[PDB]
Amino acid sequence: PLSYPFNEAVALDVDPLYAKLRAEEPVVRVSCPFGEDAWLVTSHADMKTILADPRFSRALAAEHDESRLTPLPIHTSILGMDSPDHTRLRRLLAKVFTMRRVELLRPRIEQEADRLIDALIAEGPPGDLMEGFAVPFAGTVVCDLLGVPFEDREQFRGWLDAFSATTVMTEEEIEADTERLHGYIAQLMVRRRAEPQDDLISAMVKASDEEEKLSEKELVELASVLLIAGHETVSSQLIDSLHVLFTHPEQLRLLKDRPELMPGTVEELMRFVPLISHVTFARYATEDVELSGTLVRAGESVLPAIPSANRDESVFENADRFDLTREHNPHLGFGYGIHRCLGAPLARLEMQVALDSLLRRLPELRCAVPAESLEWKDGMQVRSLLELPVLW
Numbered sequence: 134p135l136s137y138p139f140n141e142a143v144a145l146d147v148d149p150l151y152a153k154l155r156a157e158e159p160v161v162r163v164s165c166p167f168g169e170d171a172w173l174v175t176s177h178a179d180m181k182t183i184l185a186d187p188r189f190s191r192a193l194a195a196e197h198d199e200s201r202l203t204p205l206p207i208h209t210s211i212l213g214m215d216s217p218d219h220t221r222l223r224r225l226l227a228k229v230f231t232m233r234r235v236e237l238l239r240p241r242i243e244q245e246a247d248r249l250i251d252a253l254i255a256e257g258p259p260g261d262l263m264e265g266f267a268v269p270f271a272g273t274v275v276c277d278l279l280g281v282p283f284e285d286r287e288q289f290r291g292w293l294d295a296f297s298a299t300t301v302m303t304e305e306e307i308e309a310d311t312e313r314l315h316g317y318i319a320q321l322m323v324r325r326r327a328e329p330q331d332d333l334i335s336a337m338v339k340a341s342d343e344e345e346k347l348s349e350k351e352l353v354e355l356a357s358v359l360l361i362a363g364h365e366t367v368s369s370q371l372i373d374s375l376h377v378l379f380t381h382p383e384q385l386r387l388l389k390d391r392p393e394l395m396p397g398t399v400e401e402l403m404r405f406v407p408l409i410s411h412v413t414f415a416r417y418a419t420e421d422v423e424l425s426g427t428l429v430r431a432g433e434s435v436l437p438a439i440p441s442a443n444r445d446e447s448v449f450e451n452a453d454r455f456d457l458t459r460e461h462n463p464h465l466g467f468g469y470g471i472h473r474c475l476g477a478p479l480a481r482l483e484m485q486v487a488l489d490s491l492l493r494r495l496p497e498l499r500c501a502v503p504a505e506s507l508e509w510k511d512g513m514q515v516r517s518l519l520e521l522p523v524l525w
């Protein structure tokens with residue numbers, strides 16, 4: 134079996150092997166850094182199967198030494214459950230994490246983007262769009278939504294890496310930091326239970342207490358993954374998207390000349406940016422299933438390489454090209470089926486607001502160094518820049 138990942142992720146470059154696999158052997162046996170061997174899935178159609186078809190299970194991973202890139206299995210909360218447990222947590226969030234809640238956040242989100250740009254301008258160029266914009270923008274938004282104090286960032290931010298680190302932390306460090314984040318959220322819930330605020334943690338604690346729907350551990354682990362998703366995934370996709378726009382200056386000119394392309398632009402960034410470094414979380418087969426001529430037997434795992442699905446040339450014409458006018462775009466950047474992203478309306482709002490605000494306030498925004506000089510964050514499950522220096 135081939136050793137996987139084949140190569141360490143570099144910048145936003147996609148490994149040429151994925152295009153060879155999609156064309157000649159779309160499903161291949163690999164050996165994983167931790168846990169059992171697995172079947173690597175690379176095509177769009179098979180990706181939809183293993184993400185949505187009831188024959189593939191997340192909860193079965195707990196009965197195995199789960200195929201994975203991280204030293205220990207991650208506490209994925211809702212994303213590690215099947216029905217009926219998944220349905221219980223999913224229904225809870227649907228009732229408190231509504232579209233109206235997200236749309237009512239837009240004035241505060243727009244105000245935070247303007248405040249961060251005010252600070253960038255007051256401090257003068259060169260600025261850092263990562264630590265000086267994407268990180269605190271994503272962070273204040275999710276902290277506002279969830280009810281985690283943004284002022285506690287100095288203590289919790291150093292724990293989040295333990296949910297994503299692949300090669301850069303020991304299992305002892307991962308266990309300690311995971312326990313520290315859970316313990317910190319647990320103490321926040323004691324306060325929020327007694328003194329509810331207009332945020333998601335309070336609403337979840339209240340909805341769960343009234344119907345005894347979730348245990349305290351389930352609530353703690355769920356709030357934790359929402360904080361990782363809003364703080365880390367959003368800021369990573371935002372900073373990678375800015376890198377894509379800077380390195381495709383003709384598409385950036387088109388976006389500034391036709392601002393109505395922004396909704397389609399965000400979707401094409403979701404598709405084109407290979408945000409997941411390699412694969413998302415393993416599923417396990419409950420029955421024999423044939424995928425692209427390869428038989429996956431019951432009890433075997435499949436790794437969904439979502440970035441490769443989004444480059445599938447049988448689905449997206451010129452899949453290797455970034456084209457923000459692309460109309461047909463059934464990308465899997467937000468997942469598919471039972472576990473599809475429920476933060477996607479908010480992520481879409483943040484991306485649109487962030488990019489509209491930057492292009493509106495800083496019309497001359499350009500990268501301050503050659504892209505070869507940039508430093509990327511290695512050893513994580515998503516790709517992100519450590520710094521993006523800009524002039525204006």
Ligand code: HEM
Binds near residue numbers: 472476
């Ligand atoms: C641009 C930023 C984001 C991206 C790219 C993203 C992407 C994804 C993807 C690909 C999945 C599916 C994972 C899988 O099937 O293995 C997912 C699931 C999920 N995302 Fe997001 N997400 C983002 C932001 C958020 C935000 C802001 C939240 C909420 C605060 C969130 C909450 C979730 C949850 C709860 C799930 C699991 C749903 C379930 O298990 O039923 N995400 N996301």
Ligand SMILES: CC(C)[C@H](S)C(=O)N[C@H](CO)Cc1c[nH]c2cccc(F)c12
Binds near residue numbers: 208358359412
């Ligand atoms: C999930 C993908 C976007 C990749 S794989 C990722 O960022 N994964 C993160 C690091 O492993 C964990 C994560 C991000 N959003 C989540 C929502 C529910 C449970 C979770 F565990 C996560």
